[PDB]
Amino acid sequence: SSKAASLHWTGERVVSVLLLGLLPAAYLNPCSAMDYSLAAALTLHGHWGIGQVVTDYVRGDALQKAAKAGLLALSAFTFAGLCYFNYHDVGICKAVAMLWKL
Amino acid sequence: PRIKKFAIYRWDPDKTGDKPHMQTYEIDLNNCGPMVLDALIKIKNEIDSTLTFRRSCREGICGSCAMNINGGNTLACTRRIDTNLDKVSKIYPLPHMYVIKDLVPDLSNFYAQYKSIEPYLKKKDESQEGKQQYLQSIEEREKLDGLYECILCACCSTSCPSYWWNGDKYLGPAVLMQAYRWMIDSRDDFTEERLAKLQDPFSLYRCHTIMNCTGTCPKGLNPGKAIAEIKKMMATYKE
Amino acid sequence: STQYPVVDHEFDAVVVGAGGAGLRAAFGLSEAGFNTACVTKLFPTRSHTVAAQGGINAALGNMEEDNWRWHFYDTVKGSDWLGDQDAIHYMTEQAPASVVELENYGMPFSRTEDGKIYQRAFGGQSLKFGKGGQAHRCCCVADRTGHSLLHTLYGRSLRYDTSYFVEYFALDLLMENGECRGVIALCIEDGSIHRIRARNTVVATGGYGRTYFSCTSAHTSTGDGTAMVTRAGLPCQDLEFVQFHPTGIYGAGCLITEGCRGEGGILINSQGERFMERYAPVAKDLASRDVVSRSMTLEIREGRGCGPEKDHVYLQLHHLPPEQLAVRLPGISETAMIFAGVDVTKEPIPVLPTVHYNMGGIPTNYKGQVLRHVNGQDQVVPGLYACGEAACASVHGANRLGANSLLDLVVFGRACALSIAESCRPGDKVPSIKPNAGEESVMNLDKLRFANGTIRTSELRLSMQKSMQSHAAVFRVGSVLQEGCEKILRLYGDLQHLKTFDRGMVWNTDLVETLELQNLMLCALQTIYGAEARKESRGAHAREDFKERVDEYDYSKPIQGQQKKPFQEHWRKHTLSYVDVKTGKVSLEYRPVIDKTLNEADCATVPPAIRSY
Amino acid sequence: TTAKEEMERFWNKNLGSNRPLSPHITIYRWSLPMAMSICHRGTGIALSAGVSLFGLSALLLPGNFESHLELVKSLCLGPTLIYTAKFGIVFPLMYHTWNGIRHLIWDLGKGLTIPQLTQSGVVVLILTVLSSVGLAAM
Numbered sequence A: 001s002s003k004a005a006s007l008h009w010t011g012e013r014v015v016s017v018l019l020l021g022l023l024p025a026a027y028l029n030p031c032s033a034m035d036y037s038l039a040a041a042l043t044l045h046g047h048w049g050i051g052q053v054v055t056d057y058v059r060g061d062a063l064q065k066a067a068k069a070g071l072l073a074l075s076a077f078t079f080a081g082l083c084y085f086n087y088h089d090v091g092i093c094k095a096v097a098m099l100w101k102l
Numbered sequence B: 001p002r003i004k005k006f007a008i009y010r011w012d013p014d015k016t017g018d019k020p021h022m023q024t025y026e027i028d029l030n031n032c033g034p035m036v037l038d039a040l041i042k043i044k045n046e047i048d049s050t051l052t053f054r055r056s057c058r059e060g061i062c063g064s065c066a067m068n069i070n071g072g073n074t075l076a077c078t079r080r081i082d083t084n085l086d087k088v089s090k091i092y093p094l095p096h097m098y099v100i101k102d103l104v105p106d107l108s109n110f111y112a113q114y115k116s117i118e119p120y121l122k123k124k125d126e127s128q129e130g131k132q133q134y135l136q137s138i139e140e141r142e143k144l145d146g147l148y149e150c151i152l153c154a155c156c157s158t159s160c161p162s163y164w165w166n167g168d169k170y171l172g173p174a175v176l177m178q179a180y181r182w183m184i185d186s187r188d189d190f191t192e193e194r195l196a197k198l199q200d201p202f203s204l205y206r207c208h209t210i211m212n213c214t215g216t217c218p219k220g221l222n223p224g225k226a227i228a229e230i231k232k233m234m235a236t237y238k239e
Numbered sequence C: 001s002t003q004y005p006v007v008d009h010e011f012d013a014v015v016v017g018a019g020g021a022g023l024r025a026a027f028g029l030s031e032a033g034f035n036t037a038c039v040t041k042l043f044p045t046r047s048h049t050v051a052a053q054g055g056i057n058a059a060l061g062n063m064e065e066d067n068w069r070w071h072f073y074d075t076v077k078g079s080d081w082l083g084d085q086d087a088i089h090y091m092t093e094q095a096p097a098s099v100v101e102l103e104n105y106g107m108p109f110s111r112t113e114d115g116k117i118y119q120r121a122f123g124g125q126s127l128k129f130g131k132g133g134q135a136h137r138c139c140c141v142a143d144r145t146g147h148s149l150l151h152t153l154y155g156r157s158l159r160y161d162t163s164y165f166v167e168y169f170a171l172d173l174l175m176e177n178g179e180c181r182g183v184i185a186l187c188i189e190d191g192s193i194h195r196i197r198a199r200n201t202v203v204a205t206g207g208y209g210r211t212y213f214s215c216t217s218a219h220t221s222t223g224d225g226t227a228m229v230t231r232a233g234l235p236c237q238d239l240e241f242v243q244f245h246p247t248g249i250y251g252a253g254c255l256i257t258e259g260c261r262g263e264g265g266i267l268i269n270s271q272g273e274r275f276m277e278r279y280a281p282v283a284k285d286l287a288s289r290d291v292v293s294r295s296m297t298l299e300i301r302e303g304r305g306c307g308p309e310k311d312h313v314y315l316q317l318h319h320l321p322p323e324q325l326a327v328r329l330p331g332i333s334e335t336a337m338i339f340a341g342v343d344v345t346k347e348p349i350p351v352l353p354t355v356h357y358n359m360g361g362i363p364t365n366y367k368g369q370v371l372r373h374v375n376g377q378d379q380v381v382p383g384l385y386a387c388g389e390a391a392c393a394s395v396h397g398a399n400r401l402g403a404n405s406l407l408d409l410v411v412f413g414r415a416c417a418l419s420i421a422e423s424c425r426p427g428d429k430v431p432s433i434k435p436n437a438g439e440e441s442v443m444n445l446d447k448l449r450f451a452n453g454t455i456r457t458s459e460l461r462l463s464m465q466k467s468m469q470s471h472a473a474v475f476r477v478g479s480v481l482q483e484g485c486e487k488i489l490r491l492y493g494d495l496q497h498l499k500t501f502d503r504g505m506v507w508n509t510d511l512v513e514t515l516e517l518q519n520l521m522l523c524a525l526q527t528i529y530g531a532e533a534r535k536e537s538r539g540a541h542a543r544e545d546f547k548e549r550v551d552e553y554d555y556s557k558p559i560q561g562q563q564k565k566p567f568q569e570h571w572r573k574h575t576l577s578y579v580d581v582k583t584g585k586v587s588l589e590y591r592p593v594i595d596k597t598l599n600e601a602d603c604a605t606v607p608p609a610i611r612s613y
Numbered sequence D: 001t002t003a004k005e006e007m008e009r010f011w012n013k014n015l016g017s018n019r020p021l022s023p024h025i026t027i028y029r030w031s032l033p034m035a036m037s038i039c040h041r042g043t044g045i046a047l048s049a050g051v052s053l054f055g056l057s058a059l060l061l062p063g064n065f066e067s068h069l070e071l072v073k074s075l076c077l078g079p080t081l082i083y084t085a086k087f088g089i090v091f092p093l094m095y096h097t098w099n100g101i102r103h104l105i106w107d108l109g110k111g112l113t114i115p116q117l118t119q120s121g122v123v124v125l126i127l128t129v130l131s132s133v134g135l136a137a138m
C-alpha cells in the first residue's frame, strides 16, 4: 500500500494555503518573482480543482481518461501562457494594477 | 373534523406501463397518530393497501421507515405531521436509489458497502478471545459516543450528492462514520490497515463537506465531522 | 404450480430469524464449519432486539462481588417455580461466559473506574440467595444495549460465509415423518417461493405482542414461528403467560425501560404517594415485572388515574441528577420527549402497563431441541431447534426476570449451534424431500393473495387485538376469559371471509400482513384458551376467581406430614396447546416442569416457596 | 458471498431491470450550506476558466497588454458600468476566497456543527459583499 490519495489531498490544502498567502503578498509586494509564483500556484490549484470536478461528474472509462488528458493540455497551455505573459509583457501584478486604475 | 392532504410517490412494478407518479390522500387528524408513519399506516389500513413501505419499531430506532418527507431524509415515525392544514405533505422514497416498489428502495449496495469496511473488532491475537473481558477506560469509551448510535438509516448517504453521482464507488457518510467508529475503538488492533483501505480517489475522497448528511440525520449524529477526522487521520497516520 | 416458481436450496442448517438469538445461532453454526442459511423477513439490524434498552445479565461481579448461582436463584424465584431449573442453571452458569464473549466481539459496553463492564441494579435481583440486598449485575451499553448487541452480532456475522436470505418471509416448516427438513419461504423481493432444506432447522422468530392492541413490541412481532409450529401439529408451551411491562407511554405504547426503576427512579400515582411501598415493602419499587404492573393496573381501577381521562399512572425522573440521565439513559431522554413531549429532568412520564414479553412459545430442551409430548413423556423432534423469545425452554417460567431475555437470546443461540455441532458433522446427508412438499403453503399463499372476501385485513386484525386487550388483560376472570375464547373463535372463522386488495408479486405487504394475521390468530387462540383453563394465580397469569397459587403441595407450611397431589390436580405444570388449523380448535395437555438442575453439588435445586418481593 | 460480489449482483440486477430512480434534486429541499457548495464549484470553475482565457490569449492573440487596454476603451470608461464589469469579476473571486477559508477551517475539523455551519456561511456571504464592493472601489 502506497498513501498516494491522501498525499495528493494534503498537497491540495498546502497549495490552497499557499495561494491564500499570495494574494496579499502580491498586493503588498508586486514584482518579477511574485508574478511567477502566483502563476504557478494559480495553475496547479485550478488543475487539481477541475480534476476533482471531472473525477466527480465525468462518468465512464474512456471519457474519464479523455477529460483528464484534455485538462492536462489546458493546464500546460495555461501555466506556460502566464509565464510567457510575465517574461514578455508587463507581468501579472502590473497587468492587474493597469487593468484596475482605469 | 381536521383534514390533511398527503401527496405520495407511487410505482407498481407489477402493472405494465404504469410509471412513477404521485397519489394524493386525505386523513382526519383526530383519528390519526402524530407521526407521518401513523398517517402512512392509517391510509394503508383504511384507504388503499397497495401503499407499500418498510416499518418495524415505530420508535425511530430500527431505521426501517426511512424516507424523504417534504424534501429532507428522516424517519416517518420520528417526523410529526405539520398540523398546518394549508400545506400538502410530499412523501418520497430515499433520494437517488432504485425504486423496488413505491417507497421501498434497494439498499443492498448500501449494505454491501457496510460489509467492505469490516465493522467488527479485530485483534492481532484472536487466540485469547471470549475468556477475558477486554479493558477499556471510560475516557476511551467516550470516543464512541455519537458514533455507535448509528441505526443505518440511509437517510445519511442518500442525501449526499456525491453518493448520488458516485454511490457505486464512494462509500458515503453512514458507512464511513462506522469505519471511523472502529478506528477510535481503543480495543481495535487494526487501526492502520483500516485507513489503507481508503487510499483511492472514491472510497473516502468524493466527500467535499457539503454537510447534507449531518443536517439530515434523524438521530442528530454527525457523520460529516467524523469523516473530517478520517481525512485528518489519513494525512497524519504513520507508515 | 404453473403460477409460482419453486427454487430449492441445500444447506447444513437453516436459522429462521436474524434477531439477537437467530444471528448468534447463525454465525455460531457457520463458525463450527457449517454451511448455514439464515432466513429473515427484516434486514437483521431491524429485528426487534434493537429496541432493547435495559441490558443483559451476567454475574461477572463488576460492581460488588457476585456468584452466578445467586443469579440462578433470582431467575427461578422470579419464574414462580414454573421455570425449568435445568435450563435456568445452564443459562446463569453460562452468563458471564456469554457476556464476556460479546464484549470481545466488540460490543461497546459502558465502563467503570476499573475499565470493566458497567453493571446495573435491576428488577428482582439479589445477593446471597435473596438475603444480601440489591445486586448490581445488569451489563449494559448506556440506554441502548439491545441496539449495540444486535449490531455487533450482525457485524461479527459478516466475517463468516453465512447465507443470508434477507427479506424472505418463511411460510411453514418442511416436515416429513415427524422430522424437520427445512423451511418453505416467500421471497418478498420478487414474490418467488424458495424451499430451503437442511439437516437442522433453528426457529428463532421472537414473540407475538401484536396479538394485543397495546404492546411495546414492533409491528413485526407476529409469532410467525410459533404459528409455523402449531401448523405442523407440534405443541406450544405456556402461551397464556404474557408479561405486562409496567412502563410505556399511554398512546403509541413505546417502551420506557425498567432501567429507569433500577437507576433510582420512582412510580407516582394520583394522590402522590410512592405506592410501590404500600404494595411491596421487602424489595421496594424494583420488584418483579408482574407485581409492579399489578400494583399499577389495579390502582387505575381504584380511581387513582393520572391523565386526561384517568386511565394511566406516572414514572417520575424529576429527582435524579441531570448529569446522570444524559449519561446512563440517553435513549429515553429522546423518546419521552418525541412521543409524549417530556423533558425527562423536570417532568414525569405517563406510563401504563402494556404487553411486552412472551414467556410461552416452542417447547424446548436446555439444548434447544424442540419438544413434542408423546405419551405423557418428552420427545426430541429430529432436526428442529428453537431459541429466544420464540422458544420456551422456560428459563423464564411464569414471569421473566428483567434483563434476561437478551441473555436468553445469546446463550440458547450458542446452545442451538453446539447441539448441532455435537450431534452431527457438516456435509452430512441432507435428507431428501417429496417433489410437492410445502404444496399447502403455496396454496394458502394464493388464496390469501387473490383474496376477495368481505372483511378487510386491518379490521379483523383490530377486532382480535381489542378482544385480547379486554378479555386477557393483566387481571382476568373465568367469566370474561370464557367470553373471550368464543369471541376469538368466531374471529378465526372470519379469516375465511377476509379481503386483500394488492395482487402483485413484488413487495405485497398487503399479502404478508395477512399471513402475519393467521400467524397471530393461532398464537391468540392458544393464549386465551390456556388462560381460561389455568385456574390458579402464578406469575403474570393472575386469576381473580383463583387467587390461590396451586402447587403440588401447600408450600406455606412444612412439606412433611402432607401428601402429594396427583398431576391433574395441581397447576405447577406447563401448558401444551395444539390447534386443528381447519376447525380452529385448541386442545391442551400438560407436562411437568423440570426441578432438578444439572449438578445438585454445583447448583442446588431450589424448592417452591411463598413468593413476594 | 463477498461484499464485492454483492455489489456486482446489485448493479447487474438493477441496470437490467425496469426500476426507476427515486427523484433527487427535483425534490430535495435546499439548505444554505448545500447552495453554498454549488457556488464554490460555480465560482471555482469560472475563475479557472478566466485564468485559462488569460494565459491562452497571451499565447494565441495579437498585440501586447497595453495594446489591449487602449483597445478596451471602445465604448470606453463609463464609470457606473466599468465599475459594474469590475465588480462582477471580483465577486466570484471574493466568495470563493472567503468560502475557501471556511473549507480550510473545516479540514482542520473545526466549526462542523449545524448551527456553526449556517453562521459561518452568513459570515462568508456578508464578507464577500463587503470585500467585493470595497475592492471594486479601490
Ligand SMILES: *Cc1cc2c(cc1C)nc1c(=O)[nH]c(=O)nc-1n2C[C@H](O)[C@H](O)[C@H](O)COP(=O)(O)OP(=O)(O)OC[C@H]1O[C@@H](n2cnc3c(N)ncnc32)[C@H](O)[C@@H]1O
Binding pocket: C016, C017, C018, C019, C020, C021, C022, C039, C040, C041, C042, C043, C044, C047, C048, C049, C050, C051, C052, C053, C054, C055, C056, C145, C146, C168, C169, C170, C171, C204, C205, C206, C207, C216, C217, C218, C220, C221, C224, C225, C255, C257, C356, C357, C387, C388, C389, C390, C402, C403, C404, C405, C406, C407, C409
Ligand atoms: C419488545 C421489547 C423487548 C425488550 C425491550 C424493549 C422492547 C420494546 N428491552 C429489553 C431490554 O432492555 N433488556 C432485555 O433483556 N430485554 C428487552 N426486551 C426483550 C427482548 O429484547 C426480546 O425478547 C428480544 O429482542 C427477542 O429477540 P429474538 O431474536 O428472539 O426476536 P427478535 O429480536 O424480535 O427478532 C425477530 C427476527 O425474526 C425474523 N422473522 C420474524 N418472522 C419471520 C418470518 N415469518 N419469516 C422470516 N423471518 C422472520 C425477523 O426478520 C427478525 O430478524
Ligand code: HEM
Binding pocket: A016, A017, A019, A020, A021, A023, A042, A043, A045, A046, A048, A049, A050, A052, A053, B207, B208, B209, D040, D041, D043, D044, D045, D047, D048, D049, D051, D096, D097, D100, D101, D103, D104
Ligand atoms: C487564495 C484563494 C483561494 C482559496 C483559499 C481556495 C481554496 C479552495 C479549496 C480549499 C478548495 C477545495 C474545497 C473542497 O471543495 O473540498 C477549492 C476548490 C476549487 N478552487 Fe479554489 N481557492 C482559492 C482561489 C481559487 C482560484 C484563483 C481559482 C482559479 C484558478 C480556484 C479554483 C478552484 C477550483 C476549480 C476548485 C474545485 C471545485 C470543486 O470541485 O469544488 N480557486 N478552493
Ligand SMILES: COc1[nH]c(=O)c(C(=O)[C@@H](C)C[C@H](C)[C@@H](Cl)CCl)c(O)c1OC
Binding pocket: A056, B161, B162, B165, B208, B210, D025, D034, D035, D037, D038, D039, D041, D042
Ligand atoms: C462540492 O461538490 C458538490 N457540491 C454540491 O453542492 C452539489 C450539488 O448540490 C448537486 C445536488 C447539484 C448541483 C446543481 C451542482 Cl450540479 C452544481 Cl455545483 C454537487 O453535485 C457537488 O459535486 C459532487
Ligand code: SF4
Binding pocket: B149, B150, B151, B152, B153, B154, B155, B156, B157, B173, B174, B177, B213, B216, B217, B218, B219, B220, B221, B222, B223
Ligand atoms: S449516521 Fe444518522 S443519518 Fe446516517 S444512517 Fe446512521 S442514523 Fe441515519
Ligand code: F3S
Binding pocket: B159, B160, B161, B162, B172, B173, B206, B207, B208, B209, B210, B211, B212, B213, B214, B224, B227
Ligand atoms: S452529505 Fe456529503 S460529501 Fe461529505 S459531508 Fe456529507 S458525505
Ligand code: FES
Binding pocket: B037, B054, B055, B056, B057, B058, B059, B060, B061, B062, B063, B064, B065, B066, B075, B076, B077, B078
Ligand atoms: S420503523 Fe423503526 S425507525 Fe421508523
